[PDB]
């Protein structure tokens, strides 16, 4: 049951640094036991993302909640710097969190950023078009839906080679 | 891993990509122990007035849902790539050269391979002719040639050339009494690249 | 997208050519196939003369967009075309292909045309790189094919519109969804 | 009654010409998100055709030059017939979800979806849950028990496609969602294809 994919779970799982409003009870896979079901009104939580999938966006049980990544100062200069932001692995996927995301921050920015980034691979991969050499050349500042296109656009100019003679 | 061992259960097919010894059935004891280790707690708390109906429970429900879909998708690739795998040798040759192995058959399994190769039977038969002439689609590619003769080979093991002959010897010089109903199965699953 | 799926297209394309034979041990298909007299040119699909010139039977000659001055002002006027160019046969870089193989034997001048052949293949090629460099606000009701060729539009096919759903998701959302003073997702 | 049609009927419909009559209708499945019309007539037609270029063969059942031609031609097109039919039957491998949807919308005749495909696809599918047998039936599915709500393969239909022109070189304004505005003879202006599972069946347009 999803917008399939082999990657069909990596989903519902980035931990967040949600904080809390009101009152909570028994955490469950936290340190608790038959020792809280009752806490205070503001604490940050680290938090996955399948039982706060359907958790309310208006009703605050939790609160206004970002990661610090997601947190929108770099995220601001990077649609300014939708130019040379650069990636690397500390977050490898970067591309369609917002996918699930955007309604959730009460501040109403988070795809316009996204789609601004994307939209430099509409610009980006005109240098991308051919297998010059060997194993491997560029392999991660990737997330891993560019992974596959990219993988991808290789196999085919390298199947055009065998097309361009008997080859 | 925590959902993660497909990774690992599919790399049974590590190093069988087209220089495979042979295949078996990973990957279900251990994991499908989980199926009925959990359902007692998903649940435990049924139709209880453990909590009379409030928000307490809501993300547990869902504690289960994943599991599940977890569980039950990753199965789902679990043969899915196998019917993939052998549907392309199988596109290779009929069920003349069956699998390697014939003990990497995860038990309903059965169910799967009998009914792939026979809903496609099925689709042969209205394929072809209206009768049906299962038509040969993907080997011996011979023009009109030669009927009975024996080749050269390389070195190919599974042994499941029962086709007319008394023993062909499907190897490397399996140079015999050779018809053409004989040799009517295997292309390009590894053999003759070169007569 | 391939090698030669493509062939299954531009191959049964049609020259005509000369064989050695008049009508053969058989006389003649039940089909658009004209008489066969040797010493006389013929008119044939071009999987065969394939299939003929190196069973040693006939000789052939090509089209005649296969020429020096066509393909000298084709280019030029390549150059400024904006958009799209003279299009001789419109798959003749798989033609071409095919004949350069083995026709070489007694074609003429078959090294200055793979010249330009080459030289305007790239220079289409690059350019169908370049058009990409103004496709702003989700511009997908709007492009490019007027004297298009295939051979090139299926070195790019699988790439980018498997991403260009996803990609402008965010903006042909737009005109398919709604939400508060923001853009949709 | 009113005879001389392009079928098997009185007027000679050439091998090249049986090529034409449905290699577009193939290269459209080619190039597609979603399941396209059945057809059924080519099961009589080739093994007809076939057939009767066969026995024009056998008779000269030893040559070397035209014997070999017309196998030559016969094995293309059993590339073409098998090449549809594989694709189709990955599609509907997948798509056994909500294909059974639409038929039982209306269970078309031979246009959308062949009958073959539907026993076919049912057989397929209770292999699927008599497989699932094998792993939590003790536990199988309280509720999405059988063919499930969730559990789909093959809905989208927004894979932006290319289309061929072919018809009135102005703006023949016709039957797409979008601003087909700007729409000619020889031209594209690419689209998704969702808006336009009109035209194909109307013929008006191609894909490339």
């Known amino acids: 049951p999803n917008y399939y994919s082999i990657e069909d779970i990596f989903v519902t799982q980035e931990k967040v640094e949600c904080r809390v409003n009101t009152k909570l009870q028994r955490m469950g896979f936290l340190d608790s036991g038959a020792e809280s079901d009752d806490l205070e009104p503001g604490r940050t939580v680290n938090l996955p993302l399948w039982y706060i999938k359907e958790l309310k966006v208006n009703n605050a049980y939790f609160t206004v909640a970002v990661p610090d990544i997601y947190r929108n100062v770099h995220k601001a200069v990077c649609e300014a710097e939708t130019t040379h932001i650069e990636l690397g692995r500390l977050h490898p996927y970067f591309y369609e969190f917002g996918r699930y995301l955007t309604p959730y921050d009460r501040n109403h920015v988070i795809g316009r950023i996204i789609f601004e980034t994307l939209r430099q691979r509409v610009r980006h991969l005109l240098d991308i078009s051919k297998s010059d050499g060997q194993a491997a050349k560029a392999e991660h500042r990737l997330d891993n839906i560019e992974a596959k296109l990219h993988e991808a656009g290789v196999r085919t100019n390298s199947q055009y080679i065998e097309w361009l003679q008997m080859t | 891993m925590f959902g993660e061992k497909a990774f690992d259960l599919l790399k049974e097919l590590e190093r069988s990509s087209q220089t495979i010894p042979a295949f078996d059935d990973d990957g279900v004891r251990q994991v499908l122990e989980e199926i009925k280790a959990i359902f007692e707690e998903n649940v435990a708390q049924a139709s209880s007035y453990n909590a009379s109906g409030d928000r307490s429970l809501w993300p547990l429900l869902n504690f289960r849902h994943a599991a599940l879909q977890r569980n039950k998708r990753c199965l789902l690739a679990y043969l899915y790539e196998r019917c993939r795998r052998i549907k392309a040798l199988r596109w290779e040759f009929g069920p003349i050269i069956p699998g390697d192995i014939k003990q990497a058959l995860c038990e309903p399994e059965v169910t799967f391979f009998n009914n792939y190769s026979k809903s496609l039977a099925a689709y042969m038969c209205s394929a072809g002719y209206n009768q049906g002439l299962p038509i040969d689609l993907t080997n011996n590619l011979r023009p009109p040639k030669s009927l009975y003769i024996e080749v050269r080979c390389m070195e190919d093991y599974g042994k499941f050339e029962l086709d007319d002959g008394e023993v062909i010897h499907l190897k490397k010089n399996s140079q015999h009494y050779l018809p053409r109903a004989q040799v009517e199965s295997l292309v390009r699953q590894g053999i003759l690249h070169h007569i | ?185 | 009654g009113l005879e001389d049609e392009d079928d098997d009927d009185m007027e000679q419909i050439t091998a090249q010409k049986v090529l034409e009559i449905i290699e577009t209708a193939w290269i459209n499945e080619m190039c597609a998100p979603e399941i396209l019309p059945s057809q059924t007539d080519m099961l009589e037609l080739m093994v007809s055709q076939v057939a009767h270029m066969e026995e024009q063969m056998r008779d000269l059942d030893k040559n070397d030059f035209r014997a070999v031609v017309h196998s030559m031609e016969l094995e293309r097109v059993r590339y073409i017939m098998a090449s549809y039919l594989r694709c189709r039957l990955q599609k509907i491998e997948t798509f056994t979800q909500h294909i059974l949807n639409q038929e039982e919308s209306r269970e078309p005749d031979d246009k959308r979806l062949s009958p073959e495909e539907t026993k076919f696809a049912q057989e397929f599918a209770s292999n699927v849950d008599e497989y699932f047998h094998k792993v939590a039936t003790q536990y199988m599915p309280n509720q999405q028990r059988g063919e499930a709500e969730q559990r789909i393969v093959t809905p989208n239909l927004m894979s932006h496609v290319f289309l061929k022109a072919n018809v009135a070189v102005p703006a023949v304004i016709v039957g797409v969602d979008d601003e087909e505005v700007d729409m000619a003879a020889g031209s594209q202006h690419i689209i998704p294809y969702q808006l336009v599972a009109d035209l194909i069946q109307n013929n008006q347009a191609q894909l490339i």
């Open chain 3, 1 to 185: 997208m391939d090698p030669s799926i493509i062939e299954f297209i531009g191959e049964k394309c049609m020259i005509s050519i000369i064989p050695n034979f008049s009508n053969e041990p058989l006389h003649l298909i039940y089909g658009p196939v004209g008489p066969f007299r040797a010493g006389f040119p013929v008119f044939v699909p071009l999987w065969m003369a394939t299939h003929l010139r190196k069973q040693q039977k006939c000789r052939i000659v090509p089209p005649e967009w296969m020429d020096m001055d066509i393909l000298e002002e084709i280019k030029e006027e390549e150059k400024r075309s904006k958009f799209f160019t003279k299009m001789p046969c419109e798959h003749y870089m798989v033609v071409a292909q095919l004949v350069m193989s083995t026709a070489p034997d007694d074609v003429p001048r078959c090294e200055e045309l793979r010249t330009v052949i080459k030289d305007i293949f790239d220079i289409r090629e690059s350019k169908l790189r370049t058009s990409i460099d103004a496709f702003i606000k989700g511009e997908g009701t709007y492009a490019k094919l007027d004297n298009l060729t295939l051979l090139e539009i299926h070195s790019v096919r699988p790439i980018l519109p498997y991403s260009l759903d996803h990609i402008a998701r965010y903006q042909r959302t737009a005109t398919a969804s709604q939400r508060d003073t923001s853009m949709l997702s």
